[PDB]
Amino acid sequence: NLYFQGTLRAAVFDLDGVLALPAVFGVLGRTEEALALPRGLLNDAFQKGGPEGATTRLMKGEITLSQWIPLMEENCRKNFSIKEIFDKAISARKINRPMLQAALMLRKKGFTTAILTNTWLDDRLMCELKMHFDFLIESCQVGMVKPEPQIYKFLLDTLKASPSEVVFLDDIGANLKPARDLGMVTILVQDTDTALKELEKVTGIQLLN
Ligand SMILES: O=C(O)c1cccc(-c2nc(-c3ccc(Cl)c(Cl)c3)c(-c3ccccc3)o2)c1
Ligand SMILES: [Mg+2]
């Protein structure tokens, strides 16, 4: 193909909500329910400030987990423990086995695979995943966060791939928008079985049955 490579050759997976469960937003919704807080209250506090908010600064590696905790508690006030809510949920994270198996099968079939995720520095599971993927890109290690355009350029430069050769799976639609704009294939992971059927369709690799 002189001009354009439309056959997929790389598969990029988000971590929380895709390769590992649960994602934080569900965590917070179920916490609102359990504590009888107004719905969306914790998820609003979590995202307060947008690109300048405490959570983006944590994902970018600008601040550490210990610095973030009292900022999140302040956002909540703007008697539960943020430290406990997050430590309990993070301790209970589990690999999404059907998703991991699909990633391994794509790699066996010659795909370059990568993890691209927003994550945090804990100043107080990844080793396993690392050996089974070609690349691991963590927001707080590179100093960039999804959905900033930059980190998608970094991903493509790391893969040495054009956007049309890449399929990207994420639980968050905002994170797929820049990839879809660049011409990547995108899959929104709301339910793992539907996402795998869609991944089978676009790659032509059997992943189900
Ligand atoms: O989907 C995204 O792009 C996204 C964006 C911003 C934050 C996060 C985010 N996820 C987590 C997270 C992942 C798994 C678990 Cl089980 C939990 Cl409890 C949290 C934390 C996070 C934020 C502050 C402290 C620790 C983690 O931050 C994820
Ligand atoms: Mg996610």
- Cα 81 to middle of ligand 2, angstroms: 23
- Cα 156 to middle of ligand 1, angstroms: 24
**Using a 6 Å cutoff on CB, does residue 46 contact ligand 1?**
no
Torsion over CA of 175, 19, 199 and 135, rounded to 10 degrees? 80
Ligand nearest to the CA of 171: 2
Q: If you classify domain 24-91 with CATH, what class do you get? A: mainly alpha
List the Cα angle 42/175/61 in 5-degree steps: 70
By the CB criterion, residues less than 5 angstroms from ion ligand 2 are 14, 16-17, 23, 171
For residue 147, say if its preceding peptide bond is cis, omega within 30 degrees of 0: yes
CA-nearest residue for atom 10, ligand 1, is 24
This entry's atomic model was obtained through X-ray
Report the nearest atom of ligand 1 relative to the CA of 90. Answer: 16
What DSSP designation does 165 have?
G
Give the pairing type, strands 94-95 and 20-21: antiparallel
Question: Does the 1-23+92-209 domain belong in CATH 1.10.287.110?
Answer: no
What is the number of other CB atoms lying within 10 angstroms of the CB of residue 34?
10
Direct distance between the N- and C-terminal alpha carbons of the chain, in angstroms, rounded to an integer = 33
Contact present, 116 and 168 (Cβ < 8 Å) = yes
- In sequence order, the β-bridge partners of residue 136 are 115
Domain ranges of the chain: 1-23+92-209, 24-91
User: Taking the mean position of all CA atoms in its chain, how far away is CA 104?
Assistant: 18
In angstroms, this model's resolution equals 1.5
Count of CA atoms in the C-beta half-sphere (13 A) of 17: 20
CA-nearest residue for atom 3, ligand 1, is 118
Whole-angstrom CA distances from 89 to 24, 44, 61, 64, 75 are 8, 18, 21, 18, 20
- In sequence order, the β-bridge partners of residue 13 are 115, 169
Element housing 19 (H / E): none
For residue 178, say if its preceding peptide bond is cis, omega within 30 degrees of 0: no
